[PDB]
Amino acid sequence: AMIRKYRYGAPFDTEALTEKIETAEEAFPYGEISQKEGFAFTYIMDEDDIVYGLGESNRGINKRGYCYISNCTDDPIHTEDKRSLYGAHNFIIVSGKTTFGLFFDYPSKLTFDIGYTRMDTLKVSCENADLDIYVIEGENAYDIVKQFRRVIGRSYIPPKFAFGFGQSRYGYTTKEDFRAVAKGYRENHIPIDMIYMDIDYMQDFKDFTVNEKNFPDFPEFVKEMKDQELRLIPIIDAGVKVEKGYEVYEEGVKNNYFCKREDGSDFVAAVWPGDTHFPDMLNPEARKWFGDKYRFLIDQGIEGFWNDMNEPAIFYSSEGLAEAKEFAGEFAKDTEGKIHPWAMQAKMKDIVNSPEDYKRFYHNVNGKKIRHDKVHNLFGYNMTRAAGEAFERIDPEKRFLMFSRSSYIGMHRYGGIWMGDNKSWWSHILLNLKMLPSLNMCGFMYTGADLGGFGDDTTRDLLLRFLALGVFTPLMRDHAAEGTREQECYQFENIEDFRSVINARYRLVPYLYSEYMKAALNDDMYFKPLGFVYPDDKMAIRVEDQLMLGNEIMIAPVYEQNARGRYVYLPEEMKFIKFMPDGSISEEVLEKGVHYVDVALNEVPLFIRSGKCIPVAEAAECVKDIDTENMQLIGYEGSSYTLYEDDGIHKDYDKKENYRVLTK
Numbered sequence: 027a028m029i030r031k032y033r034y035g036a037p038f039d040t041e042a043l044t045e046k047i048e049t050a051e052e053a054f055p056y057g058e059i060s061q062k063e064g065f066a067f068t069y070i071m072d073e074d075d076i077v078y079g080l081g082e083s084n085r086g087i088n089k090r091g092y093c094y095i096s097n098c099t100d101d102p103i104h105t106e107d108k109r110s111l112y113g114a115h116n117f118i119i120v121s122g123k124t125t126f127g128l129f130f131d132y133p134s135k136l137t138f139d140i141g142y143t144r145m146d147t148l149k150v151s152c153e154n155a156d157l158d159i160y161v162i163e164g165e166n167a168y169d170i171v172k173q174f175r176r177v178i179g180r181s182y183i184p185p186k187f188a189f190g191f192g193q194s195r196y197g198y199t200t201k202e203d204f205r206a207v208a209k210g211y212r213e214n215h216i217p218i219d220m221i222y223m224d225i226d227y228m229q230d231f232k233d234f235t236v237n238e239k240n241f242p243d244f245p246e247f248v249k250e251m252k253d254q255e256l257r258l259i260p261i262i263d264a265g266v267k268v269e270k271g272y273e274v275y276e277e278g279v280k281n282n283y284f285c286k287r288e289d290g291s292d293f294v295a296a297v298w299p300g301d302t303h304f305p306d307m308l309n310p311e312a313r314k315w316f317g318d319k320y321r322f323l324i325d326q327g328i329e330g331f332w333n334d335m336n337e338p339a340i341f342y343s344s345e346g347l348a349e350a351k352e353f354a355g356e357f358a359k360d361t362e363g364k365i366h367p368w369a370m371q372a373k374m375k376d377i378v379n380s381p382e383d384y385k386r387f388y389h390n391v392n393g394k395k396i397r398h399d400k401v402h403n404l405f406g407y408n409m410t411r412a413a414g415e416a417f418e419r420i421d422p423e424k425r426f427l428m429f430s431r432s433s434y435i436g437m438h439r440y441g442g443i444w445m446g447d448n449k450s451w452w453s454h455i456l457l458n459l460k461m462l463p464s465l466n467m468c469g470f471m472y473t474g475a476d477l478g479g480f481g482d483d484t485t486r487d488l489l490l491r492f493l494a495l496g497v498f499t500p501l502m503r504d505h506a507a508e509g510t511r512e513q514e515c516y517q518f519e520n521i522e523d524f525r526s527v528i529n530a531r532y533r534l535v536p537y538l539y540s541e542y543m544k545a546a547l548n549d550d551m552y553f554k555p556l557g558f559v560y561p562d563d564k565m566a567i568r569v570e571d572q573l574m575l576g577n578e579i580m581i582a583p584v585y586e587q588n589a590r591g592r593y594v595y596l597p598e599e600m601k602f603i604k605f606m607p608d609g610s611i612s613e614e615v616l617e618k619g620v621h622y623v624d625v626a627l628n629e630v631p632l633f634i635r636s637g638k639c640i641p642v643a644e645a646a647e648c649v650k651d652i653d654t655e656n657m658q659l660i661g662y663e664g665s666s667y668t669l670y671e672d673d674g675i676h677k678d679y680d681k682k683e684n685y686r687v688l689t690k
């Protein structure tokens with residue numbers, strides 16, 4: 027009753043929603059629609075209007091003031107000018123005098139001009155009027171978000187161990203490499219549950235293989251780690267290497283499971299392995315074949331995965347390569363100065379992730395060929411879906427760790443996401459912060475960023491501040507690019523400061539796991555912008571560098587270099603809490619209004635809301651060992667907290683034994 031659906035043309039069924047909504051008959055209820063130059067929705071915003079949403083996209087929480095294009099892209103440079111990152115999350119909310127929600131169920135290039143051209147004008151446009159638009163009504167943005175979360179279906183739920191801390195690097199290759207990470211962390215009593223495995227663990231970058239020479243008895247090594255409560259999380263790429271004798275490739279060709287050129291030949295894209303083919307992620311039989319392959323790793327005791335390059339990323343195609351070589355030939359023997367070095371540089375740049383390549387291959391959906399650009403934003407989504415559905419077949423009772431880079435709304439049912447290739451920049455702490463609530467509004471609650479920054483060289487202080495935000499993000503992983511300064515916590519002086527910040531995480535795991543489960547089982551948000559919780563407060567609704575978590579706390583991480591604190595605004599009385607590096611917990615009551623708070627490098631801050639309290643465990647070195655029996659309660663007198671807690675492994679969500687009321 028709160029959701030109407032408007033149809034334009036013959037839209038590809040993305041399966042984004044699980045609720046079937048009938049097609050409305052009356053005219054579009056807001057602004058104006060035009061099909062003159064493709065498709066365009068135009069709306070004149072009131073000056074006080076705020077615009078939420080777009081999930082994984084650039085800039086702030088209020089999206090007003092720039093331009094966002096849904097077009098999944100491999101871009102390792104996340105600067106303010108970028109219009110397109112990895113995800114496509116076409117859900118927005120206009121909040122103000124007139125308030126309403128919109129979801130553009132369209133799987134291709136979609137442009138959100140939100141006050142870029144004219145500050146008062148919101149304009150969403152695409153090439154083809156072949157889409158469903160859902161209009162969602164309600165009193166406020168929060169109401170509308172909850173309506174939407176209901177119809178897209180329950181969010182993905184990770185195993186409890188994934189709320190531990192994870193260490194990762196593009197470069198870990200041998201057993202010696204992984205053992206050193208284990209030793210570096212455990213010997214220094216820094217808590218940890220996960221070590222990620224990047225593409226070097228494969229045999230020659232081949233999906234669903236393991237380097238035979240480095241890991242002769244992989245199941246043994248996996249258990250060697252697991253016995254220490256270190257679960258190895260291997261990566262899987264979208265591209266399957268072209269190689270004679272390689273089983274995955276042979277089957278994909280023989281059974282026509284790969285994306286094809288117009289003429290029926292299997293499309294070639296270069297990635298890590300060199301020439302590869304793409305599994306036809308929109309072909310259900312192809313999906314099943316690919317997803318079933320994960321069994322190869324699961325049978326070896328692997329309990330989680332990350333899916334990468336699944337935009338799909340293309341270094342070059344065979345068509346592009348030949349073009350670039352021809353141009354290079356001309357450049358080489360041009361004596362007259364008619365071909366400048368800049369044009370050569372432009373060509374080499376042009377053949378990477380080229381929109382022309384995305385026009386060169388097709389998906390086979392029930393016998394029907396569909397050109398990949400028309401359904402581009404659905405690829406990563408269906409790769410992860412392929413994996414998720416297979417987990418359900420392979421072991422229906424068990425939760426697997428699973429997250430992806432590229433995504434579309436709907437994938438939030440099968441896996442989480444990580445925010446891709448960020449940089450060791452202080453401004454990226456704020457970016458990690460702001461993306462969170464938006465991703466929540468779109469179903470994606472298991473998310474986080476590469477802590478310490480992925481690209482470039484990080485510093486000791488930048489890593490510590492990142493980690494202090496990571497404490498609260500369900501995915502909490504330190505990841506680094508190749509050749510960068512080493513980002514492991516044991517590569518810095520005074521290691522005890524890192525142990526203190528990560529101990530903060532572990533002490534909070536029962537409370538953090540708790541709020542996540544409750545929000546996921548109730549189609550609610552784990553992070554909320556302050557305006558969702560304090561709608562009547564004009565100052566609160568514009569705060570962009572603080573977030574509410576569940577119904578108990580607010581976070582305010584430090585994101586300026588050399589800062590010893592930050593300004594915060596409290597919309598009500600709260601208790602300012604800091605996890606101190608000696609193991610103690612400091613408490614101060616701060617009243618409603620503006621404050622400056624001191625937060626040192628080795629201190630983790632949070633606020634506890636009036637009338638609320640939270641449980642805090644003693645610090646433990648892995649998730650299994652956290653003592654949840656008689657936990658300390660921090661916060662206000664006379665208040666209570668409802669703790670959720672299950673075995674963290676299976677899917678038995680609806681039991682009264684999972685709930686425990688704690689009273690301070």
Ligand SMILES: OCC(CO)N[C@H]1C[C@](O)(CO)[C@@H](O)[C@H](O)[C@H]1O
Pocket residue numbers: 100101102195196224225261334335446447507
């Ligand atoms: O976008 C492509 C590159 C750029 O470094 N990064 C991707 C590949 C990768 O470098 C090796 O597997 C991996 O470590 C990154 O996490 C991933 O985003």
